[PDB]
């Protein structure tokens, strides 16, 4: 529903009927815009980081530059110089094409993913779903961490809606 | 020439090697733990 | 009342959206 | 500039700007005050946290 | 940047990687193995197995009550538990 | 009465502050309701 | 709608008080030219 | 008065005085060996 | 000496078999709900 | 000399960094990542929540977690050899402890690896400012596994240390702090969510605005690792988006800098919202409807029939979730609507 | 072009019109506390230290003024409920119309460092330029507080020379300000123990008399002057906002869990004495004495003293409240009038049961009345179609002892529910709510707030501390990267 | 004391709104030097 806190709504409802927190879409999901998020607060970093000389302290230096450079502002060897030392070396990028391109594909990549998990389960293919998976020998059972998921599920399955559910199962 | 073998770089990337398989072990091991 | 306050914001923003895009400070190339 | 009364009464001690004693000087001094120092507040953590035991001293809202 | 340390596609394509790990790699993978197969894992890290988390009666979980006398507690669990 | 050197301008140009109110305006617009409880 | 009584006084003197900062500070070096 | 608790700690403080310097010991000796 | 990639496909396998072991270890495994 | 050989040598490049820093990172960093491993792969979390936690018990990827000490320890730092384990690897194996390990530990894994941020950093001559930005995290790291837990009554509450053990601690905010509806956490998304198409985009417009300067079909090759040459028309940028957005992003310190803030800010405003939740001060309220849910008893908003979820989440969830407390809800005081 | 931020900056050097500026930041604070103390003051009802006690009111800067030792206002009333005995000027008035004057000059002692900024003492000889010595000028100040802590130590608190500070214990509450005596021995760390506060100020101060003389003395190792770039005034910010957040923290645990520096009266009760029945447990040993000891189940209730019910009602529990409920517990569960009585829910067999009661964590809950041992005799279906232990069906009732109730019994489902839902926050109560026109829901307690103030604030001057310190340490970077490259 | 409601954003406004007016135009002009 457009408005705020029908998301909220659109969402607890979901989880419950999907288990959508479960479901190895929206993982991949969360798994880039979480990153995108850190990267873009990477990639922004470095650049601020090894931004190049052109002020004085009461002066910007935000200000050294101008529309139409010709030269990017950023050092990108003194960059990578540090960025790749700080844990590996290798695990660094020197290649600004490809680090920029990074940068697109990830967040647009996982977040599809996830465009895709909300239209995967559209037809019923929701998270996975451990409940009761866990026994011992004489089959007494041991709640797996994800029952616990599942309690909290049905807490939000039972009073969903409340009047209209006419019937045991809610097949839709 | 000649680089040794007992690495700064090499200290590290041991730590892990070492328990990994180890831990992998363990676990290709539980895979049949029934009943 | 409240509801005023709301769509106050609402809109004064809308215009900070005329200024920022029609009267928002050029880029100079030089 | 502008002297004055307690401008020149107190001259001294702004004085010597980068009078600094030469070398490492007194340092040692101060990390031993300094881990001496740690185990003051851990000692006094793990006291509070209620992971150091001592009688007459069990941490609660009784105390007299 | 100038990089100087012991060179990585040399020994993972070397023929004495293959020959000292070969025999040493699995040796882990086995030690773990044997690790589980004994059964001491679970005396390493209390983790009961399968046969043995509920006593064979009651149906209640064994949940350390007191921080301070919780040794006791875990005992007298595992205790009166199989 | 002598004057201190250090008398350096201020700076917040044409569109620095069309962020700064598009900032505050949100909040204001974000916080509105709960400051109404 | 019963809803708290500084409404106005909080959300609006949020806005009006830093926004009249920011407006100063414009103006302020926008006139830098005498222009303004 | 040196409760078991108590003599907890110390242990502990000994355990961690022990790891400290253990570990610089080692350092000196391989930064020495440059 | 060792050509690369015959190192890369026999140590993938080995991700592909081991891995391979964990899924089908969730259906028998203890953890499956039998 | 005598300080600086130790200097000297552990200072200098030899591909894996370690310095100053890495003597506190490096231990305590790893020990960490151990913690966490073993948990999920021996170590069990029956005697806390009478939950399996361990491939070892059968637990899979998703389900294996570190559990978090029972409602019976609080905030006890849970010592191996302390009063309450007394060094007993297997016991204080049992009553959790791992946790407050590869929380501690961890919590300086952090400390210590800004440092080295700073290190690496002040030694490069570049601006430590990325060490800054790191803050992101601790502060969230700091408040939503010490602060919060602090705040409320045991480790327990904490974080789980799990994949799904950690879900549970989404819903339970929800359910219980009802976080969702909190302005800072908001923030909180919309700074990540916020910074994500910030990066997504800047990654792709950047692309696309590049100066065929290689020759073929390899663009990733093309440019010079070697000097300055803005690889992307800096100026087919602005005249692009000022025509398909309205706005350009004229200048690259700003906009390679406004990436820095975005998410570092979200977060904090997340970390301080949720510094709430650990003294129960949530905003789960909004008095202003539910005080006029009294009455019209017709009169609905999301609002409420969202609190509602939240109403059922709990009564269902804490009996299992809680244990310590011996919950008991007879078939009848569960919250249902007609049907199931 | 000089953006905002860096427009404080100005000074740095010429610390002639900083000493004006920290001189302000003063003479505003100063202000505040005796400012809001008025409103405070000008709001506080005494009327009642037994259910009205400032903390419910609201009161956050008026608990401290009891701390120290003010405990009244020139009105002949007190915070402990005294009669006839009015303090001297220093008076709840006295320490706000203290605080008035004082901001008041310093805010002409600060209108001055301005114009008289350029001053010889500002100015280094040897150097021709304005420097400050640090290494040493901290040393200096460093004296003067110990000097005081101790000349507080010893010279206040022990009650040698002035009043004690704000104690009491667990029972009353009878709290007073009464002097204390530094107990050094071990529990002299037990937080909770008072005289373990005295005893740390008078043995600091000596720790820090030391100090300064040492620092007013020795100088910095240039190895150190070299790291820390002493000299910088910008390093000694990032060297105190560091120990200030951290000062933070403690007072943000020392608030919340229990100390003697933060007591059970001036602040609202710890939310962990409700965790455990702590107010009802303590209780039921005193009304067992009173029982087994040959009284009235009746005598024996309206044995237990009010305010000490009343510290077992969950309603002043500090978590229950919200981050945006605007305010002061009153307009909460409204203004506490007077208790009730226990009540002791019975089962229509006769025996014996208990209302479950809510853990901090739910603004919902359900009401169960388990039998003795935690077995389940009564409880308000929801479903109801398939009650099978209904108030109703399985006939509760409810009696009552002590309070205003007294001896008296309700039989009706209706009521007896009720009574029932509202017993499930500990002890029922009678809150005139029209007065201030309160809500039904919940607030937190002054301890509550302060906590989460003395917490994001912390929180976040932490970010202060890296963002300075790494502006301190990389001053040099901080314009640009440097032209040169390519060399690593 | 049973007072009118926009008390507040009535008579503070009031202040606030013109008064901001001034201090713009003065500090508009105080830095055609651009000193302030
Ligand atoms: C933003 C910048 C971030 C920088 C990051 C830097 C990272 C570096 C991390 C180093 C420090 C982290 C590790 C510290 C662990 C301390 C262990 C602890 O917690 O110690 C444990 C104890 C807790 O005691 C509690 O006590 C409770 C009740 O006991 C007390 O009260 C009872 C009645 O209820 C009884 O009377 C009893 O006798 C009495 O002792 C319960 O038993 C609880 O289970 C128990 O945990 O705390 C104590 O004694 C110790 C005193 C507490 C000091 C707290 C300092 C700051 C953190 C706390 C803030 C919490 C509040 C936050 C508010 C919002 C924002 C701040
Ligand atoms: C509080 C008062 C005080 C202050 C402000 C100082 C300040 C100083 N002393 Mg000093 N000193 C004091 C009291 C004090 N001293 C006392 C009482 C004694 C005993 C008489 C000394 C004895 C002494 C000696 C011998 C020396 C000093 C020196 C110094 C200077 C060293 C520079 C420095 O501080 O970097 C050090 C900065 C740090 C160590 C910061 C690191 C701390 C962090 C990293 C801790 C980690 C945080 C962690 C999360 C918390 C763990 C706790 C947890 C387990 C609970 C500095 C000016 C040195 C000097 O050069 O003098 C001019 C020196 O040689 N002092
Ligand atoms: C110094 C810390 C401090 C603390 C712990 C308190 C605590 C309290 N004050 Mg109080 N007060 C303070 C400072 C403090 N005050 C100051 C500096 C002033 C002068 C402006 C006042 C003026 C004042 C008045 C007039 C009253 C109080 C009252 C109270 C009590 C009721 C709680 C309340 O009103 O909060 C309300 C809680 C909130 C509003 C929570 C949300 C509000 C803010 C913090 C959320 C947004 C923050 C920020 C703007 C977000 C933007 C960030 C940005 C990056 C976008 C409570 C004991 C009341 C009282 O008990 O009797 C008078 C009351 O009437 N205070
Ligand atoms: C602890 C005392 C303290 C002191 C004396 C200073 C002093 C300074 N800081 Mg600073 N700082 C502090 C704490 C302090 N800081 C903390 C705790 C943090 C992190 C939380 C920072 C983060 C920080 C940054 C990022 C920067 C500074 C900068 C500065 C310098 C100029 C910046 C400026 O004044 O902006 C002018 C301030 C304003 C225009 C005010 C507007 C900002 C908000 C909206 C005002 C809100 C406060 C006000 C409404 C009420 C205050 C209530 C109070 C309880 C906070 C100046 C030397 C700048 C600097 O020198 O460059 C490195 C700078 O860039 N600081
Ligand atoms: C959040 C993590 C964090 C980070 C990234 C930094 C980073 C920095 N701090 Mg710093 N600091 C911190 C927390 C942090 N601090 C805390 C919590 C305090 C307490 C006040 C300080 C107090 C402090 C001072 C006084 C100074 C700094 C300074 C600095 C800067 C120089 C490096 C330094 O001083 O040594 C870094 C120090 C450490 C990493 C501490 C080491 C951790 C301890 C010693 C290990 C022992 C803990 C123990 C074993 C744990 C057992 C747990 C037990 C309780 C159960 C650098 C930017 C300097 C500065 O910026 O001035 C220019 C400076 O003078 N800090
Ligand atoms: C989505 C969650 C998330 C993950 C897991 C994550 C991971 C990481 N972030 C890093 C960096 C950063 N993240 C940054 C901003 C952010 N990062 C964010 C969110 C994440 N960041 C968000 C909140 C902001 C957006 C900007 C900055 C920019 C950096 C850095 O530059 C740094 C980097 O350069 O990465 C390449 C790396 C630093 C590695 C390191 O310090 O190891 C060394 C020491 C460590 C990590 C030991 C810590 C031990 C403690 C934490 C014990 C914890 C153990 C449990 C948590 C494990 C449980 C596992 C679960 C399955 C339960 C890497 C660890
Ligand atoms: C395509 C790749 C490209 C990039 C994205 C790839 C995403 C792949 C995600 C897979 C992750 C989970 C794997 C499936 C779980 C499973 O099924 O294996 C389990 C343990 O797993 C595991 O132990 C997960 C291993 C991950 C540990 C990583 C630690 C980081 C340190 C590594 C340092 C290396 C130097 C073992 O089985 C579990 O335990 C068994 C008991 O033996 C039970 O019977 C069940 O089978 C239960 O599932
Ligand atoms: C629902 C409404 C309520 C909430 C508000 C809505 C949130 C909108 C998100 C925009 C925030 C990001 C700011 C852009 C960065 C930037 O462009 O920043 C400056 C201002 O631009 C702006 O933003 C101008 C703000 C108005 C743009 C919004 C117009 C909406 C109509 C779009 C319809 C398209 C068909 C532009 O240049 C900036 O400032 C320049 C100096 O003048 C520098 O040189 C740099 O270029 C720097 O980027
Ligand atoms: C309900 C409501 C109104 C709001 C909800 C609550 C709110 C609004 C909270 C906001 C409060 C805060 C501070 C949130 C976090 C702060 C923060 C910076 C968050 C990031 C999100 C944000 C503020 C703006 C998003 C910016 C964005 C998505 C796009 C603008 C940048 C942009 C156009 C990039 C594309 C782009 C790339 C490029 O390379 C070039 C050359 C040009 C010209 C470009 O335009
Ligand atoms: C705890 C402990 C410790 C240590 C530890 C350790 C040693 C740990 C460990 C360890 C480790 C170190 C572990 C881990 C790791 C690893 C691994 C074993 C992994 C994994 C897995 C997997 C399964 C994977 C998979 C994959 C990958 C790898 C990626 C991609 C995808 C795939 C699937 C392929 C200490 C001393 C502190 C203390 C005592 C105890
Ligand atoms: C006649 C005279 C005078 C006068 C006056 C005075 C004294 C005063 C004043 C006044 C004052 C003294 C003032 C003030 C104050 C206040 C302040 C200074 C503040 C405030 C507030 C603030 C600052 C804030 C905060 C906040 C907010 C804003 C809201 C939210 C929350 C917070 C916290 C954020 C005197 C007496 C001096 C004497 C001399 C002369
Ligand atoms: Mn809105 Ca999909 Mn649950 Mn049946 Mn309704
Ligand atoms: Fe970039």
Redesign the interface.
């Known amino acids: 529903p457009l408005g705020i806190s029908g998301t909220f709504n659109f969402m607890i409802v979901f989880q419950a009927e999907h288990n959508i927190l479960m479901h190895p879409f929206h993982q991949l999901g969360v798994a880039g815009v979480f990153g995108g998020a850190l990267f873009c607060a990477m990639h922004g970093s470095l650049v601020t980081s090894s931004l190049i000389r052109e002020t004085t302290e009461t002066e910007s230096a935000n200000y050294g530059y101008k529309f139409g450079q010709e030269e990017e502002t950023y050092n990108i060897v003194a960059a990578h110089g540090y960025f790749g030392r700080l844990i590996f070396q290798y695990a660094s990028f020197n290649n600004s094409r490809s680090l920029h391109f990074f940068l697109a594909a990830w967040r647009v990549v996982g977040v599809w993913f996830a465009a895709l998990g909300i239209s995967t389960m559209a037809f019923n293919l929701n998270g996975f779903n451990f409940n009761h998976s866990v026994i011992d020998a004489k089959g007494n059972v041991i709640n797996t961490w994800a029952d616990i998921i599942n309690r909290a599920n049905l807490g939000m399955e039972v009073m969903h809606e409340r009047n209209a559910h006419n019937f045991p199962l809610d097949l839709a | 020439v000649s680089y040794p073998i007992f690495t700064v770089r090499w200290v590290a990337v041991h730590t892990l090697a070492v328990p990994t398989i180890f831990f992998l072990g363990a676990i290709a091991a539980m895979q049949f733990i029934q009943r | 009342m409240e509801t005023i306050t709301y769509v106050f914001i609402f809109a004064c923003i809308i215009a900070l959206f005329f200024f920022a895009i029609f009267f928002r400070e050029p880029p100079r190339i030089t | 500039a502008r002297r004055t009364w307690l401008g020149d009464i107190l001259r001294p001690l702004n004085s010597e700007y980068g009078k600094v004693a030469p070398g490492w000087g007194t340092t040692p001094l101060m990390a031993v005050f300094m881990g001496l120092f740690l185990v003051f507040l851990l000692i006094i953590l793990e006291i509070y946290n209620s992971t150091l035991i001592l009688d007459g001293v069990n941490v609660s809202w009784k105390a007299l | 940047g100038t990089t100087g340390e012991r060179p990585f596609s040399d020994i993972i394509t070397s023929v004495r990687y293959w020959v000292i790990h070969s025999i040493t790699i699995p040796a882990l993978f086995i030690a773990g193995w044997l690790f589980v197969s004994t059964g001491l894992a679970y005396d390493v890290f209390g983790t009961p197995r399968p046969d043995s988390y509920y006593a064979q009666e009651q149906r209640s979980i064994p949940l350390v009550t007191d921080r301070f006398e919780a040794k006791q507690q875990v005992e007298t669990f595992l205790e009166q538990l199989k | 009465?002598?004057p201190?050197p250090?008398?350096?301008?201020?700076?917040?140009?044409?569109?620095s502050?069309?962020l700064?109110?598009?900032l505050?305006?949100?909040?204001?617009?974000?916080?509105?309701?709960?400051?109404?409880? | 709608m019963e809803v708290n009584q500084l409404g106005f006084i909080a959300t609006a003197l949020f806005v009006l008080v830093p926004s009249v900062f920011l407006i100063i500070l414009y103006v302020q070096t926008e006139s830098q030219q005498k222009s303004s | 008065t040196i409760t078991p608790s108590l003599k907890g700690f110390f242990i502990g403080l000994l355990s961690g005085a022990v790891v400290l310097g253990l570990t610089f010991a080692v350092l000196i000796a391989i930064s020495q060996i440059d | 000496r060792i050509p690369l990639w015959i190192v890369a496909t026999v140590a993938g396998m080995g991700v592909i078999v081991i891995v391979g072991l964990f899924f089908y270890g969730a259906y028998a495994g203890l953890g499956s709900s039998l | 000399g005598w300080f600086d050989i130790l200097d000297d040598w552990l200072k200098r490049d030899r591909f894996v960094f370690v310095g100053w820093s890495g003597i506190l990172l490096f231990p305590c960093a790893y020990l960490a990542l151990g913690g966490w491993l073993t948990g999920t792969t021996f170590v069990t979390s029956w005697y806390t929540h009478g939950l399996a936690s361990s491939y070892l018990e059968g637990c899979n990827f998703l389900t294996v977690a570190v559990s978090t000490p029972a409602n019976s320890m609080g905030h006890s730092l849970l010592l191996l050899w302390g009063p309450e384990a007394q060094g007993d690897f297997t016991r204080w194996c049992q009553l959790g402890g791992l946790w407050t390990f590869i929380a501690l530990h961890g919590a300086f894994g952090l400390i210590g690896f800004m440092l080295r941020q700073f290190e690496i950093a002040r030694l490069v001559g570049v601006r430590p400012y990325n060490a800054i930005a790191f803050s992101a995290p601790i502060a969230v790291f700091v408040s939503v596994f010490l602060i919060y837990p602090l705040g409320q009554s045991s480790w327990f509450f904490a974080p789980s240390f799990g994949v799904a053990a950690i879900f549970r601690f989404l819903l339970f905010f929800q359910g219980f702090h009802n976080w969702t509806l909190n302005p800072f956490h908001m923030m909180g998304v919309a700074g990540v969510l916020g910074g994500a198409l910030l990066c997504a985009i800047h990654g792709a417009t950047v692309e696309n605005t590049l100066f065929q300067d290689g020759e073929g079909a390899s663009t990733f090759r093309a440019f010079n690792p070697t000097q300055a040459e803005e690889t992307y028309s800096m100026v087919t940028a602005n005249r692009f988006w000022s025509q398909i957005f309205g706005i350009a992003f004229s200048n690259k310190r700003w906009l390679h800098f406004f990436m820095l803030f975005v998410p570092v800010t979200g977060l904090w405003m997340s970390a301080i919202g949720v510094v709430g939740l650990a003294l129960n001060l949530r905003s789960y309220d909004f008095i202003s409807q539910e005080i006029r849910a009294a009455e019209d008893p017709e009169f609905e908003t999301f609002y409420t029939k969202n609190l509602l979820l939240n109403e059922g989440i709990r009564a269902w969830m804490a009996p299992q979730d809680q244990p310590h407390e011996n919950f008991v809800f007879p078939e009848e005081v569960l919250p249902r609507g007609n049907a199931l | 072009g000089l953006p905002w931020y860096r427009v404080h900056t100005v000074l740095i050097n010429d610390p002639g019109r900083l000493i004006a500026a920290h001189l302000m930041h003063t003479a505003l604070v100063a202000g505040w506390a005796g400012s809001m103390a008025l409103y405070e003051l000008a709001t506080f009802d005494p009327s009642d230290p037994v259910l009205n006690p400032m903390w419910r009111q609201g009161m956050f800067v008026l608990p401290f003024m009891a701390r120290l030792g003010v405990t009244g206002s020139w009105s002949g009333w007190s915070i402990t409920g005294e009669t006839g005995i009015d303090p001297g000027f220093w008076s709840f008035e006295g320490v706000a119309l203290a605080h008035i004057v004082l901001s008041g000059l310093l805010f002409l002692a600060a209108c001055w460092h301005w114009v008289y900024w350029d001053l010889e003492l500002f100015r280094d000889p040897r150097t021709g330029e304005p420097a400050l010595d640090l290494p040493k000028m901290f040393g200096i100040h460093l004296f003067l507080a110990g000097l005081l802590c101790f000349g507080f130590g010893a010279f206040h608190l022990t009650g040698l020379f002035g009043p004690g500070m704000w104690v009491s214990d667990p029972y009353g509450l009878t709290g007073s300000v009464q002097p204390v005596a530094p107990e050094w021995g071990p529990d002299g760390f037990n937080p909770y123990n008072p005289g373990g506060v005295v005893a740390h100020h008078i043995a600091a101060g000596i720790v820090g008399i030391i100090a300064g003389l040492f620092h007013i003395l020795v100088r910095p190792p240039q190895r150190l002057y070299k790291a820390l770039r002493m000299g910088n005034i910008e390093t000694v910010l990032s060297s105190s906002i560091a120990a200030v957040f951290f000062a933070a923290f403690v007072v943000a645990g020392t608030m919340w869990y229990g100390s003697a520096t933060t007591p059970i009266e001036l602040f609202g009760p710890t939310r962990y004495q409700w965790d455990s029945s702590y107010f009802q447990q303590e209780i039921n040993r005193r009304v067992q004495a009173s029982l087994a000891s040959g009284a009235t189940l009746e005598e024996a209730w309206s044995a237990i003293p009010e305010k000490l019910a009343f510290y077992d009602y969950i309603g002043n529990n500090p978590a229950k409240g919200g981050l945006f409920r605007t305010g002061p517990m009153n307009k909460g569960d409204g203004i506490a009038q007077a208790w009730k009585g226990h009540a002791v829910f019975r089962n229509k067999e006769g025996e014996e049961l208990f209302v479950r009661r809510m853990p901090a964590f739910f603004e919902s809950f359900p009401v169960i009345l388990t039998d003795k041992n935690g077995v389940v005799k009564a409880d308000i279906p929801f479903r109801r179609a398939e009650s099978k232990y209904s108030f109703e069906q399985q006939g509760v009732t409810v009696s009552f002892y002590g309070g205003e109730l007294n001896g008296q019994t309700f039989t009706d489902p209706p009521t007896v529910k009720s009574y029932a839902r509202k017993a499930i926050f500990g002890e029922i109560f009678e809150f005139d709510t029209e007065t201030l026109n309160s809500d039904g829901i919940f607030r937190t307690s002054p301890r509550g707030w302060f906590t989460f103030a003395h917490a994001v604030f912390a929180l976040l001057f932490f970010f202060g501390h890296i963002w300075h310190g790494a502006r301190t340490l990389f001053r040099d970077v901080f314009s640009g990267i440097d032209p040169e490259l390519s060399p690593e």
């Open positions: 009465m002598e201190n250090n008398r350096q301008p201020v700076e917040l140009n044409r569109t502050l069309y700064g109110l598009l505050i305006l949100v909040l204001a617009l974000l916080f509105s309701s709960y400051f109404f409880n």
